[PDB]
Amino acid sequence: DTTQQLSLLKHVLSEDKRPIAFIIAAGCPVSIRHNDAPLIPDVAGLTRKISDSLMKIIQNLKTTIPNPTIEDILSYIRLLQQIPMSGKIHDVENSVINALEESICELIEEEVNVDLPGNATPYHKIAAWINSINREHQVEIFTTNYDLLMEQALEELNVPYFDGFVGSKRAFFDIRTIEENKLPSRWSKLWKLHGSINWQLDKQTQTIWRGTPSKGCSLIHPSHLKYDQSRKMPYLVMMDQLKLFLNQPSAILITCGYSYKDQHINEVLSQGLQTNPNALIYGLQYDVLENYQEAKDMALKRSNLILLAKDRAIIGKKEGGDFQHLASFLEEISQ
Amino acid sequence: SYYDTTQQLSLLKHVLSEDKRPIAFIIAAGCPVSIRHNDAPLIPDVAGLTRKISDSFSLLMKIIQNLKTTIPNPTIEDILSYIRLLQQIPMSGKIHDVENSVINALEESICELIEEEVNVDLPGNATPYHKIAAWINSINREHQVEIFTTNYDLLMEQALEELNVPYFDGFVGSKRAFFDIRTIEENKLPSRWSKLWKLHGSINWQLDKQTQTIWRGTPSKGCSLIHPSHLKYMPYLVMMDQLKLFLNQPSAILITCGYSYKDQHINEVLSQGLQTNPNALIYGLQYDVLENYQEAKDMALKRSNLILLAKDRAIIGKKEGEWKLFFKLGDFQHLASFLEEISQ
Amino acid sequence: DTTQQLSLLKHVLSEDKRPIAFIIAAGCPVSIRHNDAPLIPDVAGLTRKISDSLMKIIQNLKTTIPNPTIEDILSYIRLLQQIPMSGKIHDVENSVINALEESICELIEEEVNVDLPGNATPYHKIAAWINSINREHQVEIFTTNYDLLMEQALEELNVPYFDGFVGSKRAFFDIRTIEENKLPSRWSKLWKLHGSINWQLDKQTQTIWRGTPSKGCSLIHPSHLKYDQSRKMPYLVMMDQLKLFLNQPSAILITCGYSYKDQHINEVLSQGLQTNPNALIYGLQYDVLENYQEAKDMALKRSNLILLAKDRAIIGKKEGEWKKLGDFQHLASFLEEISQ
Amino acid sequence: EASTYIGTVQDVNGANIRVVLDINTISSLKFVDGQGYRIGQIGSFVRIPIGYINLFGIVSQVGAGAVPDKLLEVEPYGHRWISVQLVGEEGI
Amino acid sequence: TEASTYIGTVQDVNGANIRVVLDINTISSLKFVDGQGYRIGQIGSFVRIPIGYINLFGIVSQVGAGAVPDKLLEVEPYGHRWISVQLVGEEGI
């Protein structure tokens, strides 16, 4: 039963000489409790908070789409923004779009600007477990959150991490550091797929410099124009780094809180699983196993895919979650 | 201040006679214009296509005036990009105040008209394309000759088939011909095999269902991915990367014919490649007066390893000068004849 | 015992070393059932489909030939149309032989134009296994069928393959690149001996180009004039590639559904087996062992050939006995199990 | 390396330099801002910059006649050496 | 590969005294060109050296161990496949 793959995961963690990593979704911080309340609101909570603060566009989008998320709303707003005379599509006087997007950005900015709690955070336990292993294979972690909680957790233990950016209040984006990929093994690497409120673009050119959070402008969900010969706002570089990590010798990788609701991530995951035969994904499911149809389909299609849920477990394409629990298990295995 | 045609012709003849140094080409819309089957050329130019679309089709003409406010005289690419942007927005029919689905009908109509106009066969074995194909087979070079095209027709493909010229355009398969992307970067292709890249697409491109996998084959009715770049979230990016990577090869040479340098992305890529590699050389060949090409003259003044050839003007090594009209090599047929004479 | 044979086959095929190749006959479409019916029936199905679609030629050949097939009929029609005044056998004013030739050719092309079903196709399993091995010795596939099913499934699996034709809708017949063999290792070779349903000849010369299926016209069972050579080659060069694979150090070969009813194939396989003793063949039979007298004779003659059937297992030119792999879906399942 | 670059000095005998042509062979054109000059011709001049001032010289021998002794014994199939004779120099 | 009327490649230049190494594999006798029988490099015969667009002509002056360069004899004393060609004129455009 459960003891089988528990011992299996303990053994593969004890199996060195192979790279390890993790995927952080919005569920892990949401399940973290601060003052008996979630530290970070969920996607539904974020949408409700946004609605708390011009629903014609939402109603129009609801005709062809079910209950949307913040990403779809902001993408639609920007898409109307590029169109010059897009105001006539929804009422008139296309100036409410800029004010609405600025207000939404501000609301998100002070919504996600939350300091990490004390030493009881399991992020500290994860960082300690990672640092306690002296394996040559460095760990590169990709997250989807719009905050910098993991940055604070890693910086609280003096753990070396690199996010692709270096410098000062106007730190630039070093492009070829990923190219030659020549870094000491002691260092670790970090990537934010959708970014945080830290990154901000520049008026003169698309530089997306990192630094002190500027007033008014923030970069989130990179989907802007890519006609500037890359280096504009590249999530493609993160995707390429993920593909390279899938192209190295096969290793079993895990994930935390992933809902398998990202088509871009799902496509590259399927491509990596097809290219690397022994590649294994240890994505769990802290919910009903029937609530993840995409995960079940991926497990059925890819034999090497491993899926575990609260009510069932899909192992070997045949059917059969807490971040704190995983952190405690890792800490116990480390000792 | 005065340049000699014969010196440049001899230089080019010596250059083409080499074998190891990599060679490439760019075929623009001005190349098929120089070949005529009827009284008019077998394929019209960009301006001819725009005029045909304009007079073949007050609400329709609003879009042309709407784009002209922030841009010069619109072309086919601008119109297609605007239609794509309109289809991106669901309720975008209020801008034109014509329902919300006539845009799709107009897109289908213009795509069908373009496919009908472009699906032509080149007549006769004396076409310059056949001469170029024969020239490619003449010398068994150490490095194969690559070809880049920004056209929409399949004249180059048919010419290559006619003279038994193996090639590889990034597509493998007999029925569906799926896009293989790992073999492109792996690049362990046969030495004799050439390559051909269509930067703006052609009539044989069709888009699949929600799978969105791209494939090539027999063109279908009401479907043509002749979009120059369109939009995405892609073959175009890897083709641009292939061009840039080729431009970085040692002592690489790239030849342009019939290209007016009107584009911006291509000029930026060429400038970046020229700045990065100090040994690359580009032969800018024109068939008009150089005063018409502001971007080309700006780039020739900025860069030192760029050579321009026009009817009555030439810029060599950041020093604009005058010929000793002249430079009959600007025409595509004359270039093919020169290549055939060099091979023979 | 059967188990020892299966284990040996698993540990000789699953091991990466000698090159791998398969032969696929017309029996493979029989083993796949769509809507409780086979996707494409056996040769006899096509024959009596044509029959129910002018028996005079049939009984004329029946006098000296047993129960015939379509290939014999079309070859006889071609031999007739070589002769200018060939109507003396059948009436006058020659139009029937032609009209029969077209009627049957587009009838066959309409009968064969079938789309593959969903992801449960065994071809998908074979393609996945092919993608699961990255050995230097690539896998070349020989087929006697006419459909596009195998390459359709392979393209649906996103894998490269070279079939001797390069180009576009008017792709010609590449000839030299066949035998410089300067191709990437990851690439695989696909050869169809009896032809496809899209190949079309040309009026100017024998071009046998491959591309968009020509309206009505198609090339099936190449048997026309071969005096010119070079042009209209694929048949001869297909047998040549088969012979070269039969020779050279290659301790692996798999058969599936072959009925051993081809004289031009039996002779060349016997010659290759005699010339190459180190190589081995694992010919199977989805029937009783007694239905293949030619296969039994070949097994008795050449010891290198291994013949297995439902009735028994002929090993080392000697008849054996039992005390599952005939099913092609079972073969795909076994391949998937070996790969996994 | 920058343009207008030929090779590297590998010998000195007072007033007879022996120079090695580099590996990027077969080119034999070496285009420099338009017109290209054939590499290592008999009558051509060369320039050797030392810090701030330049040294000029005239080619005298090209091929197997310029290569030193031991290299021919090491490999007789390689003749990519030229013999430059000094003429003058350009001051500040 | 190499076209007809091929003899060798230049391996030494001394202003107006070219040295050529014969690249013919063997059978230095009657290299047929255009149905006419010409002989491989001989004392009284001419050679042609094409440079891009103009052809330099020359006349053979020495064949054998005399034409071998200075230290090539020192490296090996049994190799003699060189000829000494002296330039005469050129053909323009």
Side-chain angles (χ1 to χ4, degrees), chain A residues 5-7 9 12-13 18-19 21 25-29 37-38 41 43-45 47 51 53 61 65-66 68 71 73-75 77-82 84 86-87 95 99 101 103-107 110-112 116-118 120 122-124 126-128 130-132 141 143-144 149-150 153-154 158 160-168 171-173 175-178 180-181 183-185 187-188 190-191 194-196 199 208-211 213-214 216 220-223 230 234 237 241-246 248-251 253 256-259 264 268-270 272-273 275 277 279 282-284 292 295 299 303 306 309 313 316 320-323 327-328 334, chain B residues 1-3 5-6 8-12 14-17 19 21-34 40-41 44 47-48 50 53-57 60 62-63 66-67 72 74 76 78 80-83 85-87 90 93 101-114 116-118 120-141 143-152 154-155 157-173 176-179 181-187 189-202 204-207 214-217 219 222 224-225 228-229 235-261 263 265-267 269-271 273-286 288-290 292-301 303-306 308-310 312-318 320-321 323 329-330 332 334-339 343, chain C residues 3-13 19-29 31-32 34 37-41 43-54 58-66 68-71 73-84 86-87 90 94-95 98-109 112-114 116-118 120-124 126-133 141-154 160-168 170-173 175-181 183-188 190-199 205 208-211 213-214 216 218-223 234-237 239-245 249-251 253-254 256-260 264-265 268-270 272-273 275 277 279 282-284 286-289 291 294-295 299 303 305-309 313 316 320 322 325-328 331-333 335 339, chain D residues 2-23 25-68 70-72 74-76 78-91, chain E residues 1-22 27-69 71-73 75-77 79-92:
Chain A
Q5 74 304 330
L6 289 174
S7 308
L9 61 90
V12 303
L13 176 65
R18 296 222 328 278
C28 165
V43 289
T47 53
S51 81
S53 181
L61 191 137
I65 296 96
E71 41 265 40
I73 300 162
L74 61 85
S75 57
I77 289 164
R78 293 174 184 168
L79 178 64
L80 306 179
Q81 283 204 0
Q82 287 70 241
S86 174
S95 286
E101 61 86 20
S103 55
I104 285 176
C105 293
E106 294 294 328
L107 175 54
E110 292 83 3
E111 274 278 75
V112 294
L116 201 68
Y123 284 20
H124 304 161
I126 291 305
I130 290 168
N131 288 255
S132 169
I141 296 91
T143 187
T144 63
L149 307 174
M150 59 288 280
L154 268 294
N158 290 318
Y161 85 100
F162 181 53
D163 59 346
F165 288 73
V166 67
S168 310
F172 68 104
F173 189 24
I175 190 167
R176 81 292 184 276
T177 61
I178 308 172
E180 66 267 12
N181 189 359
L183 293 180
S185 181
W187 292 353
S188 296
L190 164 61
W191 282 279
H194 320 114
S196 298
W199 292 271
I208 57 161
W209 58 268
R210 193 208 52 63
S214 299
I220 180 74
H221 293 347
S223 56
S230 294
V237 296
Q241 189 34 61
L242 183 63
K243 194 152 41 53
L244 294 174
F245 174 60
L246 300 190
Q248 60 91 36
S250 175
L253 278 298
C256 169
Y258 189 27
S259 56
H264 185 202
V268 298
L269 262 188
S270 47
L273 288 173
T275 318
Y282 264 71
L284 310 185
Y292 293 99
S303 74
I306 303 183
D322 315 325
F323 65 100
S328 76
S334 82
Chain B
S1 176
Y2 293 78
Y3 289 100
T5 62
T6 300
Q8 327 303 312
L9 266 294
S10 59
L11 206 45
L12 267 171
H14 204 321
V15 163
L16 274 298
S17 293
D19 59 356
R21 54 174 56 249
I23 303 299
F25 272 99
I26 292 172
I27 301 299
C31 309
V33 180
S34 290
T50 57
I53 290 303
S54 68
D55 63 358
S56 72
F57 309 109
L60 314 179
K62 192 264 296 179
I63 302 305
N66 202 356
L67 197 148
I76 304 299
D78 291 331
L80 187 55
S81 82
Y82 195 67
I83 306 190
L85 266 296
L86 283 186
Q87 280 188 355
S101 163
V102 69
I103 47 168
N104 298 352
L106 192 39
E107 175 190 6
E108 299 296 326
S109 172
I110 62 171
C111 286
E112 163 58 47
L113 176 55
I114 287 297
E116 195 273 334
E117 213 286 321
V118 76
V120 194
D121 188 358
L122 72 165
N125 51 0
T127 61
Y129 283 78
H130 299 126
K131 303 173 76 71
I132 292 173
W135 160 67
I136 296 177
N137 302 119
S138 164
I139 309 166
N140 194 279
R141 314 141 191 271
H143 295 105
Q144 67 290 33
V145 166
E146 306 199 16
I147 297 185
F148 300 99
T149 60
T150 69
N151 281 355
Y152 292 132
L154 297 186
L155 267 75
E157 275 94 357
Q158 307 173 22
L160 263 55
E161 315 298 4
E162 275 197 15
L163 279 73
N164 190 350
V165 186
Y167 68 86
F168 166 61
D169 63 358
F171 280 116
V172 61
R176 208 54 181 284
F178 87 101
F179 189 90
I181 207 161
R182 174 171 141 101
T183 181
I184 282 183
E185 51 89 16
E186 198 271 336
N187 220 317
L189 271 295
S191 67
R192 178 190 158 73
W193 274 36
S194 168
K195 290 178 200 118
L196 190 149
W197 321 86
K198 284 172 311 323
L199 314 183
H200 284 185
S202 59
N204 49 35
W205 300 75
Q206 295 175 44
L207 180 54
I214 182 61
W215 65 281
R216 69 156 288 272
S224 295
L225 198 45
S229 292
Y236 167 94
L237 312 181
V238 68
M239 293 177 70
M240 291 315 82
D241 182 296
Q242 275 292 110
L243 163 62
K244 181 266 290 181
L245 191 43
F246 162 82
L247 206 53
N248 278 21
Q249 273 184 30
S251 71
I253 301 165
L254 178 137
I255 304 166
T256 62
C257 64
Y259 177 44
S260 65
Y261 296 84
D263 195 351
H265 193 187
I266 299 299
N267 300 13
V269 174
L270 294 196
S271 287
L274 282 197
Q275 182 164 339
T276 289
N277 170 274
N279 288 351
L281 203 79
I282 302 185
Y283 285 93
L285 308 188
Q286 321 305 130
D288 208 350
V289 63
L290 188 153
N292 293 138
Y293 317 98
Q294 299 314 310
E295 293 85 3
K297 77 167 59 59
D298 186 74
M299 208 202 305
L301 285 181
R303 283 310 177 286
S304 54
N305 50 37
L306 182 63
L308 262 62
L309 270 76
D312 63 358
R313 193 64 61 197
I315 303 188
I316 307 187
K318 292 177 70 68
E320 171 267 333
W323 303 90
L329 183 63
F332 182 76
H334 294 88
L335 169 57
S337 53
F338 174 21
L339 282 172
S343 54
Chain C
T3 60
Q4 302 303 320
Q5 314 319 292
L6 311 177
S7 304
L8 188 152
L9 182 144
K10 290 285 175 187
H11 295 285
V12 301
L13 275 297
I20 303 299
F22 309 144
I23 184 66
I24 303 179
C28 190
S31 286
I32 171 168
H34 159 245
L39 208 61
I40 296 296
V43 58
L46 276 298
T47 62
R48 85 301 181 271
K49 204 92 61 183
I50 302 302
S51 84
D52 65 62
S53 171
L54 192 46
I58 294 89
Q59 72 256 12
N60 286 321
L61 61 83
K62 183 57 63 68
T63 51
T64 62
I65 297 169
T69 70
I70 295 186
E71 49 198 61
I73 298 163
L74 58 93
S75 53
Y76 184 80
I77 294 156
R78 288 177 179 164
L79 291 153
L80 295 175
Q81 65 208 75
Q82 311 273 320
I83 281 184
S86 170
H90 294 64
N94 301 315
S95 290
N98 299 115
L100 183 63
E101 211 186 40
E102 310 76 60
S103 58
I104 194 173
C105 71
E106 61 269 355
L107 181 47
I108 293 292
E109 91 180 6
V112 176
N113 280 329
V114 65
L116 200 66
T121 303
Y123 293 10
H124 303 165
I126 307 145
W129 168 82
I130 277 176
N131 284 252
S132 168
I133 175 62
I141 300 167
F142 304 102
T143 51
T144 70
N145 294 281
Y146 318 83
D147 63 358
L148 279 294
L149 262 63
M150 172 45 178
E151 57 273 64
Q152 195 76 5
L154 183 63
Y161 73 95
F162 177 61
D163 62 346
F165 293 75
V166 59
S168 308
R170 286 321 288 279
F172 54 75
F173 182 32
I175 187 167
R176 59 170 321 171
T177 187
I178 305 178
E179 81 295 349
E180 292 84 4
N181 304 294
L183 293 172
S185 190
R186 203 203 191 197
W187 278 44
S188 278
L190 174 84
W191 311 102
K192 320 179 47 180
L193 292 91
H194 291 105
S196 306
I197 60 180
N198 48 9
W199 301 356
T205 184
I208 194 171
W209 60 267
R210 191 273 309 283
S214 301
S218 285
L219 188 152
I220 292 300
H221 277 284
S223 58
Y235 194 30
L236 304 98
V237 300
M239 311 175 161
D240 291 331
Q241 295 298 109
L242 163 54
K243 175 212 211 193
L244 275 71
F245 182 82
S250 315
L253 178 52
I254 309 296
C256 175
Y258 186 48
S259 58
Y260 313 80
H264 275 278
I265 301 299
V268 301
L269 62 84
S270 296
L273 282 172
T275 310
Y282 292 166
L284 313 175
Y286 178 58
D287 50 306
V288 65
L289 190 149
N291 280 144
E294 291 327 288
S303 79
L305 157 67
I306 306 185
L307 180 64
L308 316 176
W322 304 118
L325 273 297
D327 191 7
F328 306 158
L331 178 48
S333 69
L335 276 170
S339 60
Chain D
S3 65
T4 78
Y5 172 75
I6 301 299
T8 303
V9 175
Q10 293 292 108
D11 188 356
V12 56
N13 198 7
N16 183 82
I17 308 298
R18 285 163 199 284
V19 179
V20 168
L21 291 203
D22 288 330
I23 301 99
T25 176
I26 301 170
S27 54
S28 70
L29 274 296
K30 200 52 182 56
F31 279 70
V32 173
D33 311 333
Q35 54 271 29
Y37 320 104
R38 203 177 328 282
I39 297 169
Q41 202 171 185
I42 292 301
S44 297
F45 284 74
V46 306
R47 169 192 80 170
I48 312 179
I50 42 171
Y52 205 109
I53 58 173
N54 311 302
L55 291 169
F56 297 100
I58 180 164
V59 189
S60 77
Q61 200 156 50
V62 165
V67 64
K70 270 72 68 176
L71 277 296
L72 277 187
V74 166
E75 60 182 2
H79 316 286
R80 309 283 308 290
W81 300 60
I82 73 181
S83 174
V84 168
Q85 162 163 22
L86 284 75
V87 166
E89 58 92 16
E90 185 267 341
Chain E
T1 58
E2 288 86 5
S4 65
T5 71
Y6 187 86
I7 296 304
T9 183
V10 172
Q11 294 289 348
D12 193 340
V13 182
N14 262 18
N17 185 87
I18 314 304
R19 289 164 198 287
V20 184
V21 170
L22 313 158
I27 307 168
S28 301
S29 57
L30 276 181
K31 175 162 170 64
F32 275 1
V33 167
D34 186 74
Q36 187 58 50
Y38 310 131
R39 206 161 287 268
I40 301 299
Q42 196 178 185
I43 301 299
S45 64
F46 290 82
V47 308
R48 170 192 85 170
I49 302 180
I51 300 180
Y53 182 76
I54 54 182
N55 316 304
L56 305 199
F57 290 95
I59 182 169
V60 183
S61 83
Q62 182 142 19
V63 165
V68 177
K71 292 206 67 64
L72 276 297
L73 290 176
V75 177
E76 72 272 29
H80 315 289
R81 289 294 281 289
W82 299 64
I83 67 182
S84 172
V85 182
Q86 183 178 2
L87 301 188
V88 161
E90 87 168 6
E91 202 281 333

